[PDB]
Amino acid sequence: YEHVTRDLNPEDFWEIIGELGDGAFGKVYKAQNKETSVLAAAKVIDTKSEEELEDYMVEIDILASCDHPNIVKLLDAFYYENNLWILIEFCAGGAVDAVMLELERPLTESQIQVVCKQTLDALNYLHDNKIIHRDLKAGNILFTLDGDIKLADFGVSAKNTRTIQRRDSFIGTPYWMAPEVVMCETSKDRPYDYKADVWSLGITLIEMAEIEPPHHELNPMRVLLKIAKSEPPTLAQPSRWSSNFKDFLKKCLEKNVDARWTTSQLLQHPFVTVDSNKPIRELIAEAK
Amino acid sequence: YEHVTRDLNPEDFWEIIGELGDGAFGKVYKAQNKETSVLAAAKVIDTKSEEELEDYMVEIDILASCDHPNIVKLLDAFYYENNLWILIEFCAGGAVDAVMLELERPLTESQIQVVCKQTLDALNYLHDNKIIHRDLKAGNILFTLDGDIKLADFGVSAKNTRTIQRRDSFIGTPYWMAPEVVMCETSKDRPYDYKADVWSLGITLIEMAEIEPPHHELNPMRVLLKIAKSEPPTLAQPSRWSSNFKDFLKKCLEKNVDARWTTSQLLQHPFVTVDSNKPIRELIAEAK
Numbered sequence: 337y338e339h340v341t342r343d344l345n346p347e348d349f350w351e352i353i354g355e356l357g358d359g360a361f362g363k364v365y366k367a368q369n370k371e372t373s374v375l376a377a378a379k380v381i382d383t384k385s386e387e388e389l390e391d392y393m394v395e396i397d398i399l400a401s402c403d404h405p406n407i408v409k410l411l412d413a414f415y416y417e418n419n420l421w422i423l424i425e426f427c428a429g430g431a432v433d434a435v436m437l438e439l440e441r442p443l444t445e446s447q448i449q450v451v452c453k454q455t456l457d458a459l460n461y462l463h464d465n466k467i468i469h470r471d472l473k474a475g476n477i478l479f480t481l482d483g484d485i486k487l488a489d490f491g492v493s494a495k496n497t498r499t500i501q502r503r504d505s506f507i508g509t510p511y512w513m514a515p516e517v518v519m520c521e522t523s524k525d526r527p528y529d530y531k532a533d534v535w536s537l538g539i540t541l542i543e544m545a546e547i548e549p550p551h552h553e554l555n556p557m558r559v560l561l562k563i564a565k566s567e568p569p570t571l572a573q574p575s576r577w578s579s580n581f582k583d584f585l586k587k588c589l590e591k592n593v594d595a596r597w598t599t600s601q602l603l604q605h606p607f608v609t610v611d612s613n614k615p616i617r618e619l620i621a622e623a624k
Numbered sequence: 625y626e627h628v629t630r631d632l633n634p635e636d637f638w639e640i641i642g643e644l645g646d647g648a649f650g651k652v653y654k655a656q657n658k659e660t661s662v663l664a665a666a667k668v669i670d671t672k673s674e675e676e677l678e679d680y681m682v683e684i685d686i687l688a689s690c691d692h693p694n695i696v697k698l699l700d701a702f703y704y705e706n707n708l709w710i711l712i713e714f715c716a717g718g719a720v721d722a723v724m725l726e727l728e729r730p731l732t733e734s735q736i737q738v739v740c741k742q743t744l745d746a747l748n749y750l751h752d753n754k755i756i757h758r759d760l761k762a763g764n765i766l767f768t769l770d771g772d773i774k775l776a777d778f779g780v781s782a783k784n785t786r787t788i789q790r791r792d793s794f795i796g797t798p799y800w801m802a803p804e805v806v807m808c809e810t811s812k813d814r815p816y817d818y819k820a821d822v823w824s825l826g827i828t829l830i831e832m833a834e835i836e837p838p839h840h841e842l843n844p845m846r847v848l849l850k851i852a853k854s855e856p857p858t859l860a861q862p863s864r865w866s867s868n869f870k871d872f873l874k875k876c877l878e879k880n881v882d883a884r885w886t887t888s889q890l891l892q893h894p895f896v897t898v899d900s901n902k903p904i905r906e907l908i909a910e911a912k
């Protein structure tokens with residue numbers, strides 16, 4: 337497609353150094369550019385056929401089209417011998433959840449503020465560009481060498497740009513057009529669906545405060561039921577946390593979607609009014 | 625694709641008898657099956673390239689996948705010598721707006737009830753199957769030989785089935801999932817976007833009452849502004865029309881989308897509690 341190379345062996349450009357992880361789409365490798373020495377994470381996805389490339393295209397497009405400091409960039413993509421290779425800028429610190437498990441402790445509040453502030457900048461850019469992440473969690477927030485973060489894994493993300501471009505496309509005099517379509521107040525443009533990411537942000541903040549997300553102790557079969565039945569989760573040990581942390585969470589973890597804050601609103605909250613990554617430089621230094 | 629034939633000349637199966645119409649995508653022909661004598665409307669769309677087939681595929685899929693008495697069926701589709709041919713079951717009476725212009729008068733109320741009732745059955749099926757028509761008007765409601773109607777022109781329709789199938793698709797324990805996604809209350813499933821068709825139904829009813837839709841006298845440049853600024857339109861000569869007609873319109877022509885009725889709710893309204901097409905048989909007989 338637009339961004340996927342054909343007929344070339346990815347391993348004539350990128351050398352596998354080792355393994356970074358392993359998941360449902362296969363193993364993820366640490367790769368090194370044979371010419372430039374630039375590092376990458378290399379997803380290698382077994383495709384049974386060419387039709388399956390369409391399943392992975394929205395993700396590639398999002399990665400190729402985004403240009404933000406807190407979103408990982410696409411370095412290359414190849415289709416070769418029935419595998420889709422996706423090469424993504426390398427984040428040397430790994431995922432936030434992996435750090436917590438290595439150190440066997442949650443992040444401190446000042447650390448959470450930095451991750452939250454930068455993660456929010458990424459989300460706000462996504463939403464501004466009609467992208468819903470849809471799988472925000474600590475496993476998909478990666479640390480850089482320099483103590484910053486980058487949001488990754490757009491594997492189930494939605495990009496409403498072509499939908500919106502087709503939505504506004506009309507010819508002739510539209511006498512029959514609904515006023516909400518006239519006013520650009522269709523679901524594609526309203527905040528409603530994007531706010532699903534704002535809830536996931538709240539859960540991820542509790543996950544960073546407590547190592548594991550709410551309801552981790554339940555039978556997995558019960559978790560969706562629990563989310564539906566229960567009031568929104570709160571920090572297990574609230575005395576440990578500032579009023580600003582607890583207030584921010586309440587703006588995210590709000591079941592009335594209309595009342596839940598947008599990323600735009602959240603950027604003005606004092607919990608994210610920070611501008612030094614030092615608490616994270618301290619963390620990742622200890623993990624090194 | 626799924627439903628488009630390659631490498632065969634459509635005119636070795638279908639004979640053009642004449643022209644039915646002409647619009648932005650070209651002329652529409654009256655066609656006759658050379659073997660069966662079955663009649664069709666034949667859309668013939670000039671495509672500059674193969675990539676353009678994707679623009680027309682949702683429409684073909686909707687036509688091929690729908691099975692309802694009040695929705696036109698796909699008979700064939702061909703890609704040949706750079707044209708996309710779409711053959712659609714023929715409706716011998718033509719469009720409602722064409723009848724009104726031929727007879728130089730609007731429909732009577734009893735006629736409108738029959739068209740409304742059948743059109744609503746079609747819409748309700750569409751919405752049940754996650755399709756938004758998006759271009760409902762009297763020009764896209766066609767009369768059959770027998771005095772029934774069929775809804776046509778899915779050229780800008782939305783089909784949210786693959787979107788919804790991808791929406792519910794998840795692996796692993798979804799600790800971070802928003803409660804509105806948990807409860808299947810995303811925009812794909814909520815009535816909100818489908819209700820745009822319910823507004824267009826209301827306008828189409830006024831169009832059938834008055835030959836032309838509200839604001840037909842304005843500079844076309846002003847129409848969208850007028851829709852936005854104005855209260856919903858009403859029948860110009862309300863003494864001519866029943867309270868049931870006027871009440872039905874108010875349920876459709878409601879700017880508060882949440883307060884506007886669904887097609888499901890409208891099916892229970894007395895304005896559509898009719899079960900004879902005789903008023904339409906009388907109309908189309910005079911037009912013959």
Ligand SMILES: Nc1nc(Nc2ccc(S(N)(=O)=O)cc2)nn1C(=S)Nc1c(F)cccc1F
Nearest residue numbers: 356364377424425426427428430434476488489
């Ligand atoms: N851009 C990027 N950099 C890294 N770096 C990384 C990953 C793991 C580790 S490890 N094995 O935990 O120390 C260290 C660095 N991983 N990464 C990506 S995109 N990882 C990743 C991910 F975070 C989510 C889904 C699929 C993935 F392949």
Ligand SMILES: Nc1nc(Nc2ccc(S(N)(=O)=O)cc2)nn1C(=S)Nc1c(F)cccc1F
Nearest residue numbers: 644652665712713714715716718722764776777
């Ligand atoms: N299924 C179908 N049957 C017909 N019949 C028809 C059309 C015009 C006329 S005419 N020329 O007005 O008398 C008579 C019959 N037209 N038709 C379709 S799909 N017409 C049409 C349409 F209604 C909207 C957009 C494109 C179209 F090609």
